[PDB]
């Protein structure tokens, strides 16, 4: 059920979106809350269900992930750069 993401991974943006919805993340372009994601063109930001985790920013170029960063969603600040990340379901009840 985990959604694995890595730089250079071939996946369409909307394919990632569907998979996130499948694991109980809601699209919320109007909130920063945990267990949702927001979409800004070819950038998808995922606010993990886990406390103490950072927002994950996934940058697409066509059907390829080009960059994955840990960010502060409130300020846009980049806190880390990643090769591989994994998103687990928003609830343990799936």
């Amino acid at each position: 059920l985990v959604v694995s993401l890595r730089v250079g991974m071939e996946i369409e943006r909307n394919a990632l979106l569907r998979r996130l919805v499948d694991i109980q993340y809601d699209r919320n372009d109007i909130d920063f809350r945990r267990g949702t994601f927001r979409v800004r063109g070819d950038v998808v930001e995922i606010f993990p269900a886990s406390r103490d985790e950072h927002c994950i920013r996934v940058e697409f170029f066509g059907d390829e992930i080009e960059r994955i960063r840990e960010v502060d969603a409130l300020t846009g600040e980049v806190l880390g750069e990643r090769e591989h990340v994994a998103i687990f379901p928003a609830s343990h009840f799936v």
């Binding site: 800004r40 063109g41 920013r57 066509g62 846009g76 980049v78």
Partner: protein, 118 residues
């Protein structure tokens, strides 16, 4: 004159499959100033790529503009390819750009020119 989102999306869908396009928010056009506050707000809103004076530049690159010279700044909202199912994504990206640039959007068709909608 005042196009609907449906009209905008259907225009882009008239291009051949595989056509590359960049959806731009023309936030500043031919205006003097450093535009420091503008660049800060757009960086804070999580945008990555901008076109500043015809140069593609990244935000958080420490951008400084000469105050007494005119500048143009476009936010690169999305970079898409015409293909099956893109309709909703085009709509969303066009809407995002229109909100950013107070009702104007620019679509750069790679290999062709630009389309201005409003």
């Amino acid at each position: 004159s005042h196009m609907t989102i449906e009209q905008m999306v259907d225009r882009l869908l008239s291009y051949p499959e595989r056509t590359k396009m960049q959806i731009l928010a023309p936030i500043v056009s031919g205006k003097k100033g450093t535009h420091a506050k503008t660049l800060e707000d757009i960086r804070k809103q999580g945008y990555v790529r901008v076109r500043i004076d015809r140069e593609m530049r990244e935000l958080t690159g420490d951008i400084e503009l000469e105050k007494n010279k005119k500048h143009s700044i476009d936010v690169v909202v999305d970079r898409i390819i015409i293909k099956d199912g893109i309709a909703a994504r085009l709509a969303d990206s066009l809407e995002t750009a229109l909100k950013l640039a107070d009702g104007k959007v620019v679509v750069d068709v790679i290999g062709e020119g630009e389309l201005l909608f409003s």
